[PDB]
Write a protein that binds this DNA or RNA. Structure first.
Ligand SMILES: [Mg+2]
Ligand SMILES: [Mg+2]
Ligand SMILES: [Mg+2]
Ligand SMILES: [Mg+2]
Ligand SMILES: [Mg+2]
Ligand SMILES: [Mg+2]
Ligand SMILES: [Mg+2]
Ligand SMILES: [Mg+2]
Ligand SMILES: [Mg+2]
Ligand SMILES: [Mg+2]
Ligand SMILES: [Mg+2]
Ligand SMILES: [Mg+2]
Ligand SMILES: [Mg+2]
Ligand SMILES: [Mg+2]
Ligand SMILES: [Mg+2]
Ligand SMILES: [Mg+2]
Ligand SMILES: [Zn+2]
Lengths: 98, 70, 213, 53, 102
RNA sequence: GACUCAACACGGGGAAACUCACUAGUUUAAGACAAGAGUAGGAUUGACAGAUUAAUAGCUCUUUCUUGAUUUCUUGGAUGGUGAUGCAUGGCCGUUUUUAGUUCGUGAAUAUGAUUUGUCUGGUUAAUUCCGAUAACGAACGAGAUCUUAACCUGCUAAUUAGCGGCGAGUACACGUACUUGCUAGCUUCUUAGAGGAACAUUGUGUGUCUAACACAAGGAAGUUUAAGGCAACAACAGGUCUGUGAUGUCCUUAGAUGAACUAGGCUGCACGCGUGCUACACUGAUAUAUAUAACGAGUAAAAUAUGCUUGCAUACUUUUCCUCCGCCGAAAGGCGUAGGUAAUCUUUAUCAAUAUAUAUCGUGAUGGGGAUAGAUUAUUGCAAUUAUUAAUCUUGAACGAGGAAUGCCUAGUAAGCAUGAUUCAUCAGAUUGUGCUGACUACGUCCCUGCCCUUUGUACACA
């Protein structure tokens, strides 16, 4: 634990977020960068904000902001993208599809 | 409003000085006189974390352990 | 263990967010309303819409994402409490939201403003309405704003009956030159079930029966 | 070091905000509504409040 | 014995109907029941201003949210009473069945 | 920001930090994505100590350790902005106007037209509400109807977290009363809340075209639609709001930021003018003691508490936080310890107030009226009280003897007087929004003044 700067996302945190998104299908972020953690994920809320934001801008997820919340949803191009990133067999799929 | 006057020069950003092959100077071996440490090894970090030989103290960059000489 | 005052407020505020969240996901599919039934076993949410085919998706795939979204937002405490049901509107010619969403859709394609209002008026009166009214305001042609009113039939503005027998909706459309306001008021066929649950077919008319021959 | 958001904000105006806008002015707090007055008057009907006299 | 059924609802339209169904339904099973107890009605009040801006004659509107509550006591078994509740009670009246054992 | 009514205790705007947008400083990247550039013989992140800085911001230097592709860079680009534009818009609100107004079909004016009639001389009404007249005959909005609250019912339906009774046991006094305490036939006057009844000008006299309708009397709880509110028609204003909004169009800015923060100041600064108010000018009073007596409300991821390692990190996610009975301490303000309550169950309401009432002191004297401005001391709220947050005690003791020209609001449980719940709220009401207590004088009209409406008339006005 070498105490790096805040918002210096470790490679272990990014792998945790992708795995949550692939298994589950959707994620809700509740935009505010002062909350220390996500309900279902033990990562600083800011790290989740940046990664989905990057995912959104590459046309992998679409979202819309009801008052005080985020509501992201994955697409088909996202599914093929992550599987190569996370090295999974070609048969596993997100839950919301089955 | 009025545009402020800048008579005070810019404070420059701090960038890290670079030295080539830092670990190679840490250990040196002769034809005789095989592997031999030249610095101090930290106490509370994992083995292999050397600590700096400052002017009058020994300091570790990972745990900030400073052990005072003399 | 909160009190009744705090509990009633929490549920009313809960329904405000959910209705506003779905109108953004289901904007283009004729959204009309939601009724929430929170049972201790499992909580049910009923969706009313016009084009239910696109709402469910292929093999009900998108409703499962909606179920996963609602459950992580409002019911993060548990893991299985919610499902979502879809329903088709009985009479879509009298749903003010359905028409306002319909009129809005045309205006973003570039249809003539006068034809679209006439088209919506004719469909509404075809479905048995006793009266209707449409209003559009904004930058129509010039740089100065103006409002256009279209009426057909009979309408009421004052009193208690105006709240019961009249249906209302409001929407807005974002053009490249600004924002346009769409207002639809539909006067339902005069039934409008009453205080004592019963159809009040006649609001104020005092018709006299024909004496038996 | 880091001095971002280090002023204590446990009370006062900056402690809370509108549930809908994120605006910090004219917040209703009776019965824990936590909504600014402009937003509330729009959504007052669906919550359950009614006008009688 | 001595089981209590409590009803709360924002709606007077429905809560009297449900309170009628239980009283008639329990009478058929030939049960001794105590008639409805109508507790005092309470109202929640909010008085905000119109006019999101600042100008104009200062006008106000008075909002009210009123709550109702009933109370029925009877002598019977718990399991027959608790299944008597799930008789398609319309979902604006939430029912709390409480045993007043002492 | 707003500048007559329709700006000026208004922006729910009671700003110590935050809010905050203004002043002086210092940091951050929380610069998506694409291409490049850089580098695994290392792109970059972080820091003890001495200097340095308001600062314990490695902000930046001297010194050298750590980290590992997260960054860095470079050309496009993209969010964000309490930045400009309410004379580019949506939505909402205020005003003309709470007045009584607005339109259509067919016919007629027509024997060019803009247009007219229907929509009217007259009586009546809160009201184009009615009767009548009649080149017009019929319709629609608005008005009225409708909704909420209040007043009458010993007549219906019910009894807990409501009452009254009934059976004992007591403490006191009388030729049965007061209170305390256990148990618990029946009833609904008192309390709470569901459904119904009641008023229609009913009956007389009078006025009236005897029509539409008005006045007085009787009965009646109620006869100004019984009283108060809610909603609100065509159309308008270049009325206010982009500083409520992930509503939004253009323009500006985007790493030496108009983004996000952090530290200290300011929004309150005082020769003057204006608006809403509070306290007064005393005896129909001030001071002290004592007696009797209301209605609408509100209440429960962080920090803190129990126990150790040399305030840092473990352990309990326990009793903690909101209203607080009672006991003890303290002049007081407050402190300490423990009940009850997620509430017709407890705070607390067969009572949580002040005007009132009784007795005494003062005695027409800027006085015992009035309480500004100042000095010293104490306790709570908060990480922080200085420009004095708020409270408590002792001293000081200003103007003000009923107010010029002008000007506001009011016709009955109303004016005026008197208090109190709630909003904002860590701590601060001289404000707003409700609620109750005591309770007058004057009219039962008019077009003189000021406004708005209708008809006739004049116009060279039409931005009127
Ligand atoms: Mg408009
Ligand atoms: Mg009316
Ligand atoms: Mg104020
Ligand atoms: Mg203050
Ligand atoms: Mg903005
Ligand atoms: Mg304007
Ligand atoms: Mg406007
Ligand atoms: Mg005319
Ligand atoms: Mg009674
Ligand atoms: Mg706006
Ligand atoms: Mg500041
Ligand atoms: Mg000010
Ligand atoms: Mg005022
Ligand atoms: Mg005195
Ligand atoms: Mg004196
Ligand atoms: Mg006059
Ligand atoms: Zn808001």
């Amino acid at each position: 634990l070498p105490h790096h700067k805040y918002s210096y996302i470790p490679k272990q945190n990014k792998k945790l977020i992708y795995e949550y998104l692939f298994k589950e299908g959707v994620i809700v972020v509740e935009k505010d960068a002062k909350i220390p953690r996500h309900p279902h994920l033990n990562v600083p809320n800011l790290h989740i904000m940046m990664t989905l934001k990057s995912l959104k801008s590459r046309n992998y997820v679409e979202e819309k902001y009801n008052w005080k919340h985020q509501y992201f949803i994955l697409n088909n191009e996202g599914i093929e993208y992550l599987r190569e990133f996370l090295h999974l067999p070609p048969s596993i799929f997100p839950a919301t599809l089955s | 409003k009025k545009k402020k006057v800048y008579k005070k020069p810019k404070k420059e950003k701090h960038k890290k000085k670079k030295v080539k092959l830092a670990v190679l100077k840490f250990y040196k071996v002769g034809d005789d006189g095989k592997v031999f440490r030249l610095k101090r090894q930290c106490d509370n970090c994992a083995p292999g974390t050397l600590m700096a030989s400052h002017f009058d103290r020994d300091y570790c960059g990972r745990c900030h352990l400073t052990i005072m000489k003399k | 263990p909160i009190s009744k005052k705090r509990k009633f407020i929490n549920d009313g505020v809960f329904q405000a967010e959910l209705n506003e969240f779905l109108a953004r996901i289901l904007a283009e599919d004729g959204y009309s309303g939601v009724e929430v039934r929170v049972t201790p076993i499992r909580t049910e949410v009923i969706i009313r819409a016009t084009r239910t085919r696109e709402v469910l998706g292929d093999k009900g795939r998108r409703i499962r994402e909606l179920t996963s979204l609602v459950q992580k937002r409002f019911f993060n405490k548990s893991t299985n409490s919610v499902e979502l049901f879809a329903e088709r509107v009985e009479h879509r010619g009298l749903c003010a939201m359905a028409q306002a969403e319909s009129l809005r859709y045309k205006l973003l394609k570039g249809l003539a403003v006068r034809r679209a209002c006439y088209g919506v008026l004719r469909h509404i009166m075809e479905s048995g309405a006793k009266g209707c009214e449409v209003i559009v305001s904004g930058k129509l042609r010039a740089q100065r704003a103006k409002s256009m009113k279209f009426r057909d039939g009979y309408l009421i503005s004052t009193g208690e009956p105006s709240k019961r027998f009249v249906n209302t909706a409001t929407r807005s459309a974002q053009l490249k030159q600004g924002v346009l306001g769409i207002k639809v008021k539909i006067m339902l066929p005069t039934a409008i079930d009453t205080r004592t649950g019963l159809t009040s077919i006649l609001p104020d008319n005092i018709s006299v029966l024909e004496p038996k021959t | 070091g880091c001095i971002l958001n280090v002023h204590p904000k446990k009370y006062g105006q900056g402690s809370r905000q509108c549930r809908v806008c994120s605006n910090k002015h004219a917040i209703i707090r009776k019965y824990n509504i936590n909504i600014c007055r402009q937003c509330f008057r729009e959504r007052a009907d669906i919550i359950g409040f009614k006008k009688y006299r | 014995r001595r089981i209590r059924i409590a009803l709360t609802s924002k709606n007077l339209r429905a809560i009297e109907k449900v309170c009628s169904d239980i009283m008639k339904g329990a009478k058929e099973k030939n049960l001794n029941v105590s008639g409805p107890v109508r507790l005092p009605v309470k109202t929640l009040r909010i008085t905000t201003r119109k006019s999101p801006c600042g100008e104009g004659t200062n006008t106000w509107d008075r909002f009210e949210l009123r709550i109702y509550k009933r109370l029925i006591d009877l002598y019977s078994q718990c399991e027959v009473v608790t299944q008597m509740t799930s008789i398609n009670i319309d979902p604006v009246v939430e029912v709390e069945v409480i045993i007043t054992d002492s």
